[PDB]
Structure formats: C-alpha cells, structure tokens
Symmetry: D2
Subunit: 458 residues, 4 copies
C-alpha cells in the first residue's frame, strides 16, 4: 500500500507522521532482544514481575494526558474517552499485580500423597498483532497478564497508531521494564509472517478483523503455534416488552455509540419485541440525534470522526446496501462534508436477517433495529449471526433472562445493564468472533505452559 506506516489526524485530514517498515536487521534485532529478555525474565520471581506491573501503572499515570492526547490525535476518539482508556489500562496493571500472583500457584491433583502438581510455566515470546480502536487498552489487556506469567511480549501495532506505539514503549521503558520483555516492531505483513515462522516466537495473540484473524491464525496453525483470536462482533441487544424501557434505551445508545461505534463488543443489532418496538425506536432515535459530534479535543463532544477514511467509505456502502435491500433510514446515513472523517450518527429500522446491516459488522455509528415477534423469535434472531462475542438482554423476567443467556451463542451476556470488558471476568467469543479468552485467570493461563510434575510414579 505504502512504503511507510502513515499517521493522519482523522479530525483534520492532515498528515502527522510516516514511519518506514522494519527492515531485516530490525526484525532480527526485535526477535533477538525478545528472546534474551525472556531468558532472564522467566527466571524472575512473580513478586518482581508484579512490582514491574505496579511501576508500569505508575509511569502510565505520570504521562496520562500526553497518552490520551496521542490516542485522540491519531485515531479520533473523543478526548474524554481517550482519558478513560488510560485510566482503565493503568488500573489493569494494579489489578493483576494484586490478584495475578495467586493464579500462578501450582495446583494440587487427586494423585495420592501429594505426588503430582500442575505448574504454570512461562511459554516464551508472544507475538501480538493489535488494532487501532483502543491503541493502549488492547495492548495492555494482553501484555499485562502475558508479562506476569513470565513471557516476553512483542507488539506489531496498527500502522495508523505508530505514534501511540512509540509512546507506550517509552513509558514501559521508564517504568523499568527490562529490554526485550516488552518491545515492538513496525513490521509489514511479510515481516509478521517471518516472525510467526521464527522459533523464537512461541505463540501469537490477535485482536482485529475476521480477515486478519484468519490470515494470522492460518500461519500460526501451520507453524504449530497457539493463538488467541479476539475478532469482530455483531452483538445482539434484546429488549423485551417488560423491560425498563428508559434504562434499555440508555444502555443501547451507550453500547452502540461508544468510541464512535468502533468497538468489537458494541451493541450492533437491536432486537426489540413487537409491543415495545415503536417506543424503543422513537426514544433511541431521539437520544442518538441529540449526541454531539465534532472536534474530539472538545471534552463535551460525544462522537468524533471515524479513525480511517477508507473504513468510513466501507461503512457508508454498508448503509447504502441496507437501504437498497429495504431498510428504513430513520437518522443520518451520510458522510459529513469537510476535511475530517465524520459520519452522521445513523439509525436503520425494518432490518431483516438477510440484510447487510444484520449480517455484517457495522464498525461505526450505525444502529440496526429489528422487530421480534416474541422472546423465542428474539433469541433465534440473536443467534442468526456468524459472530458471537457478547450480547445484552433487557427484561423484567429474571428466570427467562437466565434461560436465554444459557442459549445465547456468545462469550458474554449482560442482563439489564451495560456490557463492558473488566479484568475480573472472561472476554472473548465464538464462531467468527474467534476463540480463546482474555482477562481474569483466562488471559493469564492462555500463554502458560501448563506442566504436570509427578514424582515417584511407580
């Protein structure tokens, strides 16, 4: 595409920076340093690693506003939300420092007389391939537990946020993270292939599109390396007739429009029972129309420009196809004139399961509303997707909610509340949303060598 990774401010359209792809010597140095870093880091105590996590949290908080400004500048997130991303990322460092060490204790087994245990050993260097939508949080979500487990972490970040990548590296270096334990490289696709195929890479973690996950997962499998693939979603948000309608509407608007809609686990498919459908729709449209869109440096704006001009083009085509298919445009559905990359907050109604807005991930500020005949129909519509990341259900019927959760084909179900990732719970999905789990003890153990140690088996 280009010979450089290019940063362009999506609010203004103006070039920020260009960085050449890593050459052969640079890829080799990144791998060699990661390997020598790992060789030392794996021998450290868990207590030492936990202290390093605290130090990283401290350095991040010391540079918090510079970091948030970098995030907003390079990818357009409202500054209020970029600051929240920094806060959440730093808190993650402290949470794992506190709760992570116990997760690495050996497990007893049923083998007689305490003769066998399960140990959680470091695996090696983990190659991480990350996206631009949370340029800090996506990195730390994996890096924090991966480092605590005694592994090295080698990042290839999205080419539009290399400024953020450079800043994260500086902050982690200031915190005293040893050389090679955390590192990054501006590799092109060929460079990524080279690394996946190098024996110094033990495993791979990918957060990104379905296409990226398939292209990388195929290479990892071929190389006999484990993956965690955290890919797109088209999360259903089910509202039944007995819901608290106003709370459902508030959670819906927040779920769809957070980060200008640019969230894997955004509420994307609103599936509303016939009796409450019109009231939900009227209120949702009103709230969406009242969201403020503009300069993301302005603390009070709710929506920024989208991150990538080509992705705004693709989203508009998804809206165009949906309308051609028979969806009803209730709000927005236009690119905003000007040099920035703004797309109107949009609502499509009368969306049926055959339509683009129902079958593809809409990665921008476009809500799809589908009417369900009843709860059984709502469930069936929810599961009629190639994606399966998270889901929401609003209903006063607690027993029904719990039954529906068990039958929803996704990795997270939120009942009468706001979906989010949180260190304390598993994150990740099924079907084309990928596989593997992040956070809590799952994200820590995914990149361990789980090792049986058995004495005197005679």
């Amino acid at each position: 595409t280009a010979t450089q990774a290019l940063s362009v401010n999506p609010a203004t359209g103006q070039t920020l920076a260009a960085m050449p792809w890593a050459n052969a010597q640079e890829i080799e140095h990144a791998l060699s340093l990661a390997a020598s870093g790992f060789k030392k880091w794996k021998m450290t105590s868990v207590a030492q690693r936990a202290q390093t996590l605290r130090d990283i949290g401290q350095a991040l908080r010391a540079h918090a506003e510079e970091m948030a400004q970098c995030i907003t500048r390079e990818m357009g997130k409202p500054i209020k939300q970029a600051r929240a991303e920094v806060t959440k990322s730093a808190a993650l460092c402290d949470w794992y420092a506190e709760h992570g060490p116990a997760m690495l204790n050996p497990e007893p087994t049923l083998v007689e007389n305490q003769q066998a245990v399960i140990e959680y050993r470091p695996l090696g260097v983990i190659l991480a391939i990350m996206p631009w939508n949370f340029p800090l949080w996506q990195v730390l979500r994996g890096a924090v537990p991966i480092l605590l487990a005694g592994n090295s972490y080698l990042l290839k970040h999205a080419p539009n946020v290399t400024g953020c990548a450079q800043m994260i590296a500086r902050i982690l270096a200031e915190a005293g993270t040893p050389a090679g334990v955390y590192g990054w490289v501006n590799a092109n696709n060929e460079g990524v292939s080279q690394m996946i195929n190098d024996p110094r890479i033990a495993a791979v973690t990918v957060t990104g599109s379905v296409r990226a996950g398939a292209a990388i997962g195929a290479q990892a499998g071929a190389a006999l390396k484990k993956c965690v693939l955290e890919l797109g979603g088209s999360d259903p948000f089910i509202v039944l007739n007995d819901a608290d309608l106003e709370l459902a509407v508030k959670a819906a608007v927040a779920g769809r429009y957070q980060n200008t809609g640019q969230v894997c686990a955004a509420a994307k498919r609103f599936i509303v029972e016939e009796g409450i459908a019109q009231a939900f729709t009227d209120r949702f449209v009103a709230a969406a129309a009242a969201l403020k869109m503009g300069d993301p440096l302005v603390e009070e704006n709710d929506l920024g420009p989208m991150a990538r001009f080509d992705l705004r083009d693709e989203l508009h085509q998804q809206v165009q196809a949906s309308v051609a298919e028979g969806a009803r445009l209730l709000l927005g559905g236009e690119k905003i004139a000007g040099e920035g990359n703004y797309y109107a907050a949009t609502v499509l109604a009368d969306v049926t399961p055959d339509m683009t807005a129902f079958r593809q991930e809409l990665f921008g500020p476009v809500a799809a509303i589908t009417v369900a005949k009843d709860a059984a129909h709502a469930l069936a519509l929810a599961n009629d997707s190639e994606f399966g990341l998270s889901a929401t259900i609003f209903t006063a019927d607690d027993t029904l909610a719990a039954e529906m959760a068990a039958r929803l084909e996704c990795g997270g179900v939120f009942i009468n509340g706001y979906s989010a990732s949180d260190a304390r719970v598993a994150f990740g999905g099924v079907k084309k949303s990928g596989f593997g789990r992040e956070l809590s003890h799952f994200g820590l153990h995914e990149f361990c060598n789980v090792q049986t140690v058995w004495k005197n088996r005679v």
Copy 2:
C-alpha cells in the same frame, strides 16, 4: 490418497483384513447433519444425564473388552496384554469423568461484588476429531469422554488402517445408548476432512498425530477461525544422573522406550546419561532390551509385536541407517526381520550426538538413542535441544535439583524417579512442535467449552 479405500492389513501376517471406500458427499453431509442435530438435543441434557451415559459407555466397553482388545491387536499389531490394558484404562476413564467431571462444570464465582457476575462453561458444538492408529481406542476416548460430558458432539475421523476398530467403537457406544450424532465417525479422505473443517456445523477441531498432520490441519482450523488442540509427536528426554536409583531408572527406561513396540508419543526416546553412570546404565539397558521377547502379538508372552505400518518400518530403518552413517554406534538390532510380517529388531544406538538423526527426529519404533552428558547442566541443555517438547523424565536422588530441572525443562510433563504416562488426574500435552492445548483433568473438559461471562445489573 494412496488408494480409493481405507485399507486394513494385519502387520503380523502382511495380509489384507478389509477395505472401506472413502465417504462420499452424501455420507459427509449425513455425518455433519446428524452431529448437529445430536448436539442440538445433547446440549440441553443435564450434566447428570451425560455422566450416566459415561458410566454406560464404560459398562459396554467392559462387556466387549476381549473383542475390542483383539481388534486393536489384529489391525495394528499391539501385544495383546497391552491391548487389554488399553481397554481397561479407557473404561476406567469413563468412570473417572462420570465421578469427577460434573463439578468441573459448576459456574465460577467472580470478584464482581454481590454475586452479580459468574462464569459459565457452556457447550461449544460439534468437535471434529482426527486420531492416530497407535492407541485406537484410548486416543479416541481420551478426548471424547470429556468433550461429551461438556455437552458437545464428537465426530471422529480415524486413521485409515484402524477402520475395523472405529466401527467397533461406534457399535459399543451405540450399545451404551449414546444418542445418534452425539458420537459418530466418518471415513473421510483428506479432502473430506477439509470440507468438514470449513463447514459451520464444526465448532472446533482436535488432532492427535504427527507434526505434519498437525500443521496441515492446524492451518485449516486457523483459517476457518476454529480453535484446535494439537497433540503431536514427541522425542522425550530421559535423564539419568550419577546419583540415580539405577535399577529403577533402567526398568523405567526399558518400559518407556519399548511399550507398544516403541510407538508412543510420550515414549522415552532420547536417553541422556551423566558420564559417571553412562557405562553402567548402557550395559543394563542393552541387556534388558536384548531380553525382550518379540513375535506374534496374540501370544501373551511376547513383549514386542510387529510395527503397525510397513512404510513406517521403512522410514525407521532409514533413520537408523542415517544415524549409523553419521557415526552412531549400533549396540543392538538395527535390522528389519525377514518374513511376511512387519517386524523390526529391538535396537539401541549409542554415542549419539545432537547433530544426528536419532537425536533430531522422532524415532517412532523400538530404537533407543543414548547420549552422554558431562554433568547435570549439560543434560538439561541436551534435553531442551529439540524441536519437540511433550514429556520428560529425570532420575536423581537430589530432590532439589530434580525440582529445579523440571522448572527449566521445555515440555508439558516431567516425571521424577518414575514412569511417564497419561492419567486422567493430570494435564497431558506439549510445547514447541509437540503442539499446544492440554488434555485430561479439567483441561481436556474446558478446552472445548464456550467460557461465558454472565453479568446482571452492570450499571
């Protein structure tokens, strides 16, 4: 494919047993449709109902124990006593998971306050399983038992030389009352496997086999966004230091290398012996290997049968030939046995250095490699100088040293002063080219669950 048929040939006699055509398009569609409809019902059963099915499977196996063991021996040459032990272990597995498995599926509390969020272990769907001939029953049930208990369907593609065993397993599980589609198998060729991996009704894939199979299947699963467990080859190190219980070390070494005529993923394959005890170990090991009885595997007194596949004997002999050309010292065997059957002599290669074929490749037959280590540090470095990393053994009276070395061994299982094995109570699986993912204990059960967060009232 080599033929239009999956072909069974008795390796003791060289004679054709059976030939089965590859599944056609109708049969593949039927297997997939039935697996999907089976899963749709089975996912809705209670864990108590699934646990009882496991007991019923153990019961049915035990009712057909001798017929099952005879089929194993007939199709792939395993000594009959070992085939019977494989049946015993497999039935015991069914009972172990029926008892200990249900608790593994209980929801997990979280640190979210006031019991507002739990983690649930939900069924995933139909798991496609690609399995090898070396333990035609045990390798199937090792994964199938926990996969089934988790609420998944299991769809087997077995090794083409053991389709008789596959047909029998299916008979037994039907007798146990396993619902249609919940357990099933299909005689798919490689193209049929690809078609299934790419079908939305397959949720995930499990493979036990060679590095080459794992790479071919793992690539396809990744491309389809489907999780794998890859349980692949091993070249397990077996370290004996100067202070070992030498008698126990030799007994464990002989059993480790020569069980199933050498044909075991976690076999002791690379003996790494400290210089001070090397000669003593080598003398005892060679004499014990020389005393092993080889012949007709239906004869209980024979310790070693024929190898399962003629082409693989041939490959093994080339690996021995290459090793000798590279400088290895042949202390015992190293020849194919004349006759109609597929016998290879119990073999011992010494003076094996890390550059050699015997040190670098998986020797999947009755061929021991012995390498001398300067000291414990050299032994550890030699052990880790491998593309494989399945399991390992250390013999030393130094408890602390053993624990330190275990921590530094790049493999998924370490046995200190004992006999390596798989066991339901512990994790099994490796690192590096041995694959990834873990079987048995709670690991094999959770690998094929949808780990699902359920959080109410998050405001």
Copy 3:
C-alpha cells in the same frame, strides 16, 4: 456487504445491489459451462470465428447503451467508454480473421509427416476481472479463449455487475451458446469453490497483485494453470535528445487515460537531468489544463475515480510521498462534493525509496524522477517490483534498442504511445504476473498442446 453494490462515483448515489450467488447458482453456472463446453469443443474453428463476428455485431448494435453503463457504474469519461466499446468489437473481428490459422496443426521434424502438434481446447476457463475496463478486460481474454474452443465463466468486479449483466445479454443476443459464455456473482468463497471444482480447467486473473497472489496460490494448489495480468508501475524514460513536445503529449496521455486507472499507465517519469526542468514545466501545464468533471460530458478528460476507498488509498500514497520529501507541483487533494473526484496531481523530486516510486499509483498522480544519464535512467526503470510495460523517448535509435533489451518488462514503446493491441503480446514480469494475452499468445495459453504421433516404432 451481502450484496455486490453499484454506486455512481460521479454522484455518490446507489444504482443497484445484487446478492452473492448461492450454492445452487454456483452449481448451475459450473454445470452449464461444462455442458456448453462439451458441445462447443466439437464445433469447427470457423464456426467459432463466425460467432466472434456475431458478438462484434451485437456489441455494435448496443454500443451507446454499453458505453453509458460503463460510465455510470465506474466513472470513465463517456468519450473513453465509447472508445472501449469500439476497441472491444474490433477485437472480435480481428480474431475472427487472424485467429483460425493460429490453431492449425504444426508439422514437426519427425520423419515422413508422422507427428503433428494439435492445439486442442482445454475446458472451462474461470476469469476473475477488474472494474477499470469492464468490457475490454473481459473480451481481451474471452475472445481468444472462446476461439480456442473453451468455455469462459466470468466472475466480474462487484461494482460493475450492471455491465456484467449487459455483456451477458449482448453475447446471448449474438447467439453464443448457453454456457460457452456465462458469468456468476460469486463472493470470494464461491471463487474458491469453483477453482477447486474439476469442471474448471484453468484460471485467468486481471487485477491487483494481492488478488493475483490469492487466486494464483489456489490455482497452483489445484494443479490448474493461470495467466495473471496484475498491476504495473511503468517507467517512461525521456532522454536529453528526445522530441520533447511529443514526449510530453505521450506522457500526459499515458498517465491520465481512464483517470489514471490503467495497469499499463505511464506512472514513473524518469527524465535525464538536461531536459528534466523543461519536461516538468510542460507536463504540469498540460496536466493542469485537463478538464475534470461530469463524465457524461463528452469534453471532460478526467472523471471521478471508480471507488471511494481507492481514492482514499491514493490520497494516503500522496500524503506519504510528500512526508518522505516529494515536491507537490499540482493537485494532491480530494475535490469537495458528493462525487469521488481527485485532482490531477504531479509529484516531483521523487527518489527510489518513496511511496510514489515503489507502489502502483492507480489514479491521476504522476511521479517525476531525475536521472543523471541513460545508464541511471535504465537502473531506475528496473528498480521496481513491477514489470508490465515501459516507454523510452530518445533520438538515439541504437541506444533505445539496447535499453529495450535490458528493460525488465513485457512491452517497450520507443518514441510513441504505449497501448494494448490484438497484434502484439501483452503482459509482464515480476509482480506484474506472468503469461501473455493477445496475438497468438492469448490464444495458446488456454490450449491443450497435444502431440499426435503415428507409427512410432
């Protein structure tokens, strides 16, 4: 989407949406192609030649409708869309006249006329085609493929499915038997399914390097031959002794035809130091005078670009080049409005490390690089991952011939305007692909070359 979507790039407005082919439709396309081939392979070559004339006739009977469809779906100036129809119909007639002799059996040096080489049909050829010449790209391959006795099954670019339907109607009106020519709106999975189906004998791809690699890998895996006609970054060399005005006219036409959107466009201008400033001044003046706007207006030279995402990508390539140090002499901006227009653009002081030198710029952006002398010009020309065509302007005829021999590309134009033409080979080397189209090359690429030898005793 779940649809192939047509959007008019001049207005931004949706034209049509077509669902991807389902399993039954893919099976129907393959089954019809195979049964079509089974009869077509048994026709006389002269009957197939007559069918080509009949196709040319039907295309000319619908010429303005066809040109309007091309302009409407992908933005090409209507004058150039009409010329695409004229060229495409002429190709039908040219192969009808000259093609049959190319399929005559060859004698061999085997004694007593006992062995001959026959050019047999191969089967159904799957064709994966781009939007930039929605008609010409299809016929460039289909005409000789059909004449050789094969069926042609087209998967067209998803933004020109209207053009694809119209081509099918026209060829059917001409009397082309069912299945001999056909098309299917397959998604990427449908393409893979067809490549792996035994009814597909071979594959031809015209498109991006990325498309060629993806499809070529699948064809190779299936043991099926390809022709891959992929992107270019053609060098256009101007030496001190050139006819400078002619060099400038050819340069402007070579870069800016089809709003820059041509595989064999002149993309890298490599100009000897002595004439560099004079060339640049005149090139920029001529480019600045090109008229851009509604492509329905016959006098506009430049239309909107075909695809919004591709305009976006091109602007980033310009942005990267400027950040690397290129000098913007003209344009370099998206035009405000609902259409997809990009200013005619010129980048100078371009050096070999820059985006504008290393990537294919598939839109109206010229790159100008100064060469120390003819040897430097040659080295610059060959310093590319692409190798489709090239132009050299110089009064020194011997030097031009020597340079042509050393240029790593499939076509060299000396003191003139590069173009594809039925009479000569077309295709490149390196990442531009492999295989050749047109003349006897395009005809024989999809033949089973068969030795028939009697009484070898």
Copy 4:
C-alpha cells in the same frame, strides 16, 4: 530425515548421507545463480549453443560412470541407464542445432516493421526434480532453459544426490559458467525460502501430484510462473481390429520400462471385448517372461524399485485392488530378500471405481479393463484425474484420428510406442499438471515474451 540418504535398492545398503543445505549454502546458491545469470543473459545465442555441444561431449566422455551411478542409486537396469545417457547427450546436440532459430524475433502484423516480438531471458529458474530419470529429467528442462539465457538451479530428489554431484562435475568440466548451472541439497523449508526469494524468477517441477500441488501453490503465491509435469495414469486402448502382436509389444514395453517407474507409462489397458482375452493371455505371458534381478546383469529386464516405502505403497494399492474385486493374474508380491524387488504384476477385471484404475501405479503393475465398444473405450480412457499421454491401437486410421481429437491428454500415440522426444511437445492436462516441455515449448516457457514497438502514434 536430517540427511539426504542414498541406499542401493538392489542391496538395501547405505551408499551415502548428505546434510541439508544450511542458510549460508542456500544464500550462496542463490547469489551465484543471480551473478551467473547477469553475465549469461549477455552472451550470444551462438556461445550458449556451443556450451550445449560441450556439455554433450562431456557426458559422452563420462557416459559409463554416469550410467553406473544412476543404476547404483535407484536400481535401473544398466542398459536403460546407458540409454538415458545417450538420449540426454543427443538432446544437447539437438538444441544446439535447432534451438537458436527459436529465439529469433517474430515479426508482427503491425504495418511497416514497426513492432517485433522478442524472446528475452527471464532469470534464475528453480528446478525440483525426481529420481526416476536422474539425468534425463534434469537436462530435459535445463538444456532449453540455458539456451534461452536463463540460469538453472536444481533441487534433486534426496535419494540421488550422488547423481546430482556427478552431473554438476560434468557440466563444470564442459565449461558451463558458475551459477549458470548449479544445484543445492535443500530441504522443503529451503525450497520455500528460494521460491520466495526475488532472485528466483520461475519454477519447474517434475514429480508427483502432491509435490506439484505444494510447490505450485507457493509459486502462485509468489506471482511466479510454473511448469508442472506430474503423474500419469496413461490409457492404452486396443480395439478389435488392432495389430495384436505389435499392441502386445508396445503394451509390455510401455508398462515395464524402468521397472514401471515412468510418468508416461502405459498404466491402464483398455481392451475391446472381442480382442480382450487374446490380448490378456499374450500380455500375461510376455510379462511372466521378463527377467528380474541385479540391474548390473544385462539379461535382467526389470530391476528393484527405487524406494522401499514406495514398494510398500504399491503393494497396498495392489492389495486394495484385489480387495475391491480385481483379478490377480500374475505377481502381486514383494520378493523376499534385502533388495527392493516387486514381482511383475497383472490385475484384470479392473473397473473404474478401483484403486488400480484411479491412482497412479508407479511400479510393475498392469491394470486391464474390458471395453464393450469404441465409445466405452474412449469414456474409460478419459475417466481419470490424470491426462499425460495415451496410446491407441486400431487398424482404422480415421477412427484413431477421431479418438485422438477426443482424448483428454497432452500426447496420443497411434499404433506405436509412446516416448518423449526433443522434436515434440511433452506434458499433460488435469492433475498431470500444465505447461509443456521440449521442442520450442520448453524453450519459450521460461522466456519474457517482450513486445518492442517503435513510433506508435
């Protein structure tokens, strides 16, 4: 395997072991091939033709040593190994004489001699070759590849590295410049590395379907052209009016040459009802009369098979066919001993569903199927995933020619013995691969076909 291992298949004993090329050695092979090409492409065709003559002279000077090496490493009767050397030397001289004219520029129909087609060198061609004709398979491609001005970089089968070393010595003695011909003992990862290196222009593979698929996929992904000359399961059709004595002679020679290990062997005998029993009786008798043993003993018609694992596989294909219902008329057993001998074998009553009909049987096993009539015979012949070559025996010249036109393969022999010959095209269709070797085809496959057009205005 950590080494490429040579084992004498007549004795079962190790001959040699050679480590796989390491990173430095692969880099050196590529670097030398590229520098060799840079000079070689500048040589005159006359000089290259002289080098070919010099290679032919050098083979002839080492003819017996070469033949002995072939027999020693892969088991071929010594008389056949000598014939292999003779044919390879004659190929050098044939291309020396007839090749240069094939590189002449072509005129075009562009008026007034303004446009010509040139055949330019492409670059370094990576060759991946099999053990069955360790010398002839190499030269069959290397000779025309070199004459076209390319370099040739060989990866030979790991069981014939002694032969490979010897070939390199002979070509070096002949004065072939460094890097112009070279070889490297690469493992599969090393091959992948070279395919993906820009110094490799294109790839040629002679080998199994599995090998062609693995390599073809990689070349396609790298946007590099292939020729794939893969397995065959050639039909040999005998109609009721055939010259029966000649048909039997051709049938026996066709199946049993090189102990059956020939891509274009006659593998599927398809015999019309009326003549079936007479053909079968005579064929079985002739096959039973063939002598098998020590390939250094000239009386022996058949040697051991080359590879122990492949004998194992062949035996399983025979076992499966019998299990499916084939009738075993002769052989069908491994011969006891330390060598790798398999009995001359005949399977009859073979129907199209069977292993012996659907897979390539790469050893001394004939399959015989009965056809009800000529149409049935044609249908049986074409019911194959392979399509390399074919034979038809019939007294009727017109029927033979009609059937040849409908046979789905790259070569058809009418009333004679199939073979490759420099004067005619060689290669197949379907899973037998694509591309053609020999005559002008093997020379032009690895050229950059370049249009040069002056004054196009």
